[PDB]
Amino acid sequence: HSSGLVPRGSMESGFTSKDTYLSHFNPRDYLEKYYKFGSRHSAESQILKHLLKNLFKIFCLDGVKGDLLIDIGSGPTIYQLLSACESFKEIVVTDYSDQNLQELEKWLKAAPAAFDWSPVVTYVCDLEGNRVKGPEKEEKLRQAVKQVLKCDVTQSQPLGAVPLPPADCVLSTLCLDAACPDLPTYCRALRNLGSLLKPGGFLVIMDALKSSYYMIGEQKFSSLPLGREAVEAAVKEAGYTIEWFEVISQSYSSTMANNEGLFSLVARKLSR
Ligand SMILES: Nc1ncnc2c1ncn2[C@@H]1O[C@H](CSCC[C@H](N)C(=O)O)[C@@H](O)[C@H]1O
Ligand SMILES: N=c1sc2cccc3c2n1CCC3
């Protein structure tokens, strides 16, 4: 009840509480704000294209492939899985928010009222060489998504008591910044995701740099404002070896975030 002075759910602890993600996170509004293919060459649209070109390169051009991929903190989105369904036989989607899981389930069932991913899907098809059209690509993704589960990156068992085989890849886009109030929790969340991975499994992360908040309309949500060095240090202390790390300077529209670019990394679960 602070009226934009401070992010929603943070007056007491300094960071957006996770119950705020069950009450004030609107899936439909988050999708309209950031994913109606951003907008007409907007900062959001350029960022989405850059995210899509990196996932295509990681999954289709590089050696990131296997049986199971677990997407962590998927929200109501599926763009991050379009290229991945080409390298992984099965995908599991997860989020802390029940309204985000409902939105994902609406898309899985191709409910007419669901969000339209068509332009994003066609862009991914174009990147992959136009071997299939959008509608064929979406059905391949829908059949590959085997489970839609509740997730909490802060718990030692992120997926609760749900048994899954060790994953070949753990993917997490624009989630860890929103979920982790500090670097010790951020480091611990990367250790928690490690328990879902086979020894030597891939960890794929894409998030924002130096961002202390992000907006969903006039609703402000916290983000951990960490830099490249702090990201690399936390990924290494969580028990991972970084294969590649990229940083772009492109930031979100001034009215939606205060970030200083984005990062992408592909890491591998260490020996121990
Ligand atoms: N502790 C927690 N554990 C898991 N997910 C969490 C979480 N706290 C927040 N989240 C989720 O983190 C997401 C931030 S939005 C990221 C959505 C999507 N992956 C994309 O690329 O746009 C939300 O869906 C929110 O529910
Ligand atoms: N989901 C999204 S969109 C966006 C823009 C800028 C910063 C962040 C952000 N997130 C969560 C992490 C922090």
Numbering used by the authors: -9 to 262
Paper lines:
Nicotinamide-N-methyltransferase (NNMT) is a cytosolic enzyme that catalyzes the transfer of a methyl group from S-adenosyl-methionine (SAM) to nicotinamide (Nam), yielding S-adenosyl-homocysteine (SAH) and 1-methylnicotinamide (MNam). NNMT is the major Nam-metabolizing enzyme, and systemic knockout in mice fully prevents MNam formation.
The crystal structure of the hNNMT complex with the HTS hit shows a very similar binding mode as for inhibitor. Based on the X-ray crystallographic data of our hits (1) and (2), the question arose as to whether the introduction of an appropriate 2-hydroxy-2-methyl-propionic carboxamide-based linker on (2) is able to transform our nicotinamide pocket binder into a true bisubstrate inhibitor.
